[PDB]
Amino acid sequence: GSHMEDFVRQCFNPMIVELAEKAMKEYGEDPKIETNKFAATCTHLEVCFMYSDGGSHRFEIIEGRDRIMAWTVVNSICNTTGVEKPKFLPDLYDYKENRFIEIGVTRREVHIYYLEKANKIKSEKTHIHIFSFTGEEMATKADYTLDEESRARIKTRLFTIRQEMASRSLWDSFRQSE
Ligand SMILES: C[C@H](C[C@@H](C[C@H](C[C@@H](C[C@@H](CCN1CCCC1=O)N1CCCC1=O)N1CCCC1=O)N1CCCC1=O)N1CCCC1=O)N1CCCC1=O
Numbered sequence: 001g002s003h004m005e006d007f008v009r010q011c012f013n014p015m016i017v018e019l020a021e022k023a024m025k026e027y028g029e030d031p032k033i034e035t036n037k038f039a040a041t042c043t044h045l046e047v048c049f050m051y052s053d054g055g056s057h058r059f060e061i062i063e064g065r066d067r068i069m070a071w072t073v074v075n076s077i078c079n080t081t082g083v084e085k086p087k088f089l090p091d092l093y094d095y096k097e098n099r100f101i102e103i104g105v106t107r108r109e110v111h112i113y114y115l116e117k118a119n120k121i122k123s124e125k126t127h128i129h130i131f132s133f134t135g136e137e138m139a140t141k142a143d144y145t146l147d148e149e150s151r152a153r154i155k156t157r158l159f160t161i162r163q164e165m166a167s168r169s170l171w172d173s174f175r176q177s178e
């Protein structure tokens, strides 16, 4: 039982922790062992949720659901809006901008992480939005979807999590593991 596991459980709302646990066990991974990946799965989950709570019924949340139902909704959006079915599961869908969104949270330079995912998805359709634990962000065609206030809020949350890890001497392992 690690210090990181107890921190994760005390730092994040219980629904987020359980969803992160479910996702990992779906891929055979143990939150009790891969504890830095545990914290990461939760942050990304929280960021996605804060992101969806930043617009007006504007976004359809795709992250958090089980694989099959996530794809079911993706197909239903694709066969309603016309948009082609993504190669990989996205994180949200914008009914206002009419595009899927891939959210990223990284401990490295925002450029590197965006480039990796863009080359990964290849399709010019799914919109990419990267956040860092230092408050930078980078989004496709410089289009950041939400208003600055809701996005700055996410960056503040990420930096508070980073400081909380540091005070507990867990940050260096977390950063040195992505
Ligand atoms: C107190 C308040 C609570 C948050 C909760 C919300 C997370 C998310 C909840 C679940 C619903 C579960 N299932 C099971 C299957 C069908 C289904 O839907 N999932 C996961 C998959 C998508 C989804 O819907 N929901 C519910 C409503 C919309 C939403 O996104 N959110 C959004 C902000 C961060 C967060 O946690 N709510 C409730 C509405 C307003 C709000 O903020 N919190 C917690 C801390 C911050 C905060 O404000």
Ligand SMILES: Nc1ncnc2c1ncn2CCNC(=O)c1nc(-c2ccccc2C(F)(F)F)[nH]c(=O)c1O
Pocket (backbone or CB within 6 Å): 023, 024, 027, 029, 037, 040, 041, 042, 044, 063, 089, 090, 091, 102, 103, 104, 105
């Ligand atoms: N290794 C895995 N473990 C559980 N589930 C996995 C999964 N790979 C795929 N899936 C299912 C669908 N995954 C996603 O959608 C998704 N995964 C990530 C990611 C990837 C690797 C390590 C940590 C992360 C995370 F950022 F969460 F912490 N980042 C995203 O931005 C994102 O959208």
Ligand SMILES: [Mn+2]
Pocket (backbone or CB within 6 Å): 063, 089, 090, 091
């Ligand atoms: Mn995802």
Ligand SMILES: [Mn+2]
Pocket (backbone or CB within 6 Å): 044, 091, 102, 103, 104
């Ligand atoms: Mn993502």
